[PDB]
């Protein structure tokens, strides 16, 4: 059978970056050339192997991670990067061996007056391990006083809301990202 990229890339709604959705892909044949010969991606870079030469290759399992971030933040989706997304939302390992795919989704994810469904983790005590997924909504203690589940000065809700409006600058507009990690049941 063919691998279910259709339900990942053409999905109706994507997840918030802090709760990035992961799909495991196994026991199928995957044509990667139909993805790279679409030309409808603003970013599609591979770390580890060329796309045209990974269609000639097999892997035990293939993971597909998807989320929505800012255009200015699609840099941080790469090995060895720093920033609010790479540090507190979605980290790739230094020895990453997959492909990062992103495209502009302003027409779908931004509405007049602001779209606020998509969130990101702004406050965190320490950096994420690679492929860690944090969903805790514990109030963040930014001072010397216990916060105690109630917000206020130095007591902040860790997840902040994106403000996607269609008038935003390109880099500030929503972008959908798909991260294909390779680690034998998937071939081409």
């Amino acid at each position, epitope marked *: 059978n063919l691998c279910p990229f259709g339900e990942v890339f053409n999905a109706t709604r994507f997840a918030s970056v802090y709760a990035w959705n992961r799909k495991r892909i196994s026991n199928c044949v995957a044509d990667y050339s139909v993805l790279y010969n679409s030309a409808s991606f603003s970013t599609f870079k591979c770390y580890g192997v060329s796309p045209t030469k990974l269609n000639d290759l097999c892997f035990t399992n293939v993971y597909a991670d998807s989320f929505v971030i800012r255009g200015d933040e699609v840099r941080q989706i790469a090995p060895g990067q720093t920033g609010k997304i790479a540090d507190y939302n979605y980290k790739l390992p230094d020895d990453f061996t997959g492909c990062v795919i992103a495209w502009n989704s302003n027409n779908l994810d931004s509405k007049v007056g602001g779209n606020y469904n998509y969130l990101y983790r702004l406050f965190r005590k320490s950096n994420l391990k690679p492929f860690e997924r944090d969903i805790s909504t514990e109030i963040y203690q930014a001072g010397s006083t216990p916060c105690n589940g109630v917000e206020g000065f130095n007591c*902040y809700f860790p997840l902040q809301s994106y403000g996607f409006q269609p008038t935003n600058g390109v880099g500030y507009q929503p972008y959908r990202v798909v991260v294909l990690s390779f680690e034998a049941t998937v071939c081409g």
Partner: antibody, heavy 116, light 108 residues
């Protein structure tokens, strides 16, 4: 809850200086901490930040010369200034960045003069 | 980077007047704008974040409004201590872009 700044004076052009930001009520170890400078009449310029995770980002006019550090024990924020030039002669501030909520807590400033 | 241009660099008015300071963005930062007030010999003070939200403690005569590219600060009834310099600032910016600044003076 305040931010007290110290450690700045006359430095030769080319030398090094270290500013210090002693926090109170705020833990520099768990916030975004900011350094801005301000030359007379030339307004506010951002310098660098240290995240609550260690990540340090800089302004391309300070990259290679300024280094941010942090002491959890002494709850102090530092800014190491090196290869100094005359263009750095300004008042240096440490504030706290709250992202979309602004920069609410500011220090008092330390004047740093760099001259022959 | 976006470029914030702050409209009246110099502005003069009298006590009890209403003034409006404008900050224009190059490309559209939605509502991520903050206003500051710097009195002579003091550090800046946060007045407004999220375009229009009043920081806790700021008097009610201050109010922000804007969304997209054009924003404004309004002081309802200008007071003797309001004569200072005001800075607008992009929020969630990688380079912490401030504006040139607006100085407020006494009319004559």
């Amino acid at each position: 809850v305040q931010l007290v700044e110290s450690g700045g004076g006359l430095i030769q052009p080319g030398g090094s200086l270290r500013l210090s930001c002693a926090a109170s009520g705020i833990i520099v170890s768990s916030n975004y901490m900011t350094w801005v400078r301000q030359a007379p009449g030339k307004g506010l310029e951002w310098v660098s930040v240290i995240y609550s995770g260690g990540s340090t980002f800089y302004a391309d006019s300070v990259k290679g010369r300024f280094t941010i550090s942090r002491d959890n024990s002494k709850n102090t924020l530092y800014l190491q200034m090196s290869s100094l030039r005359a263009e750095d002669t300004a008042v240096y501030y440490c504030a706290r960045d709250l992202g979309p909520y602004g920069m609410d807590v500011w220090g008092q400033g330390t004047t740093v003069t760099v001259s022959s | 980077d976006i470029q914030l241009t702050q409209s009246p660099s110099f502005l003069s008015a009298s006590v009890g007047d209403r003034v409006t300071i404008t900050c224009r963005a190059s490309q559209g930062i939605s509502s991520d704008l903050a206003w500051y007030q710097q009195k002579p010999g003091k550090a800046p003070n946060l007045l407004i974040y999220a375009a229009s939200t009043l920081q806790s403690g700021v008097p009610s005569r201050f109010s922000g409004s804007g969304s997209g590219t054009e924003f404004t600060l309004t002081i309802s009834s200008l007071q003797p201590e309001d004569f200072a310099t005001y800075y607008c600032q992009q929020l969630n910016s990688d380079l912490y872009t401030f504006g040139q600044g607006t100085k407020l003076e006494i009319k004559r």
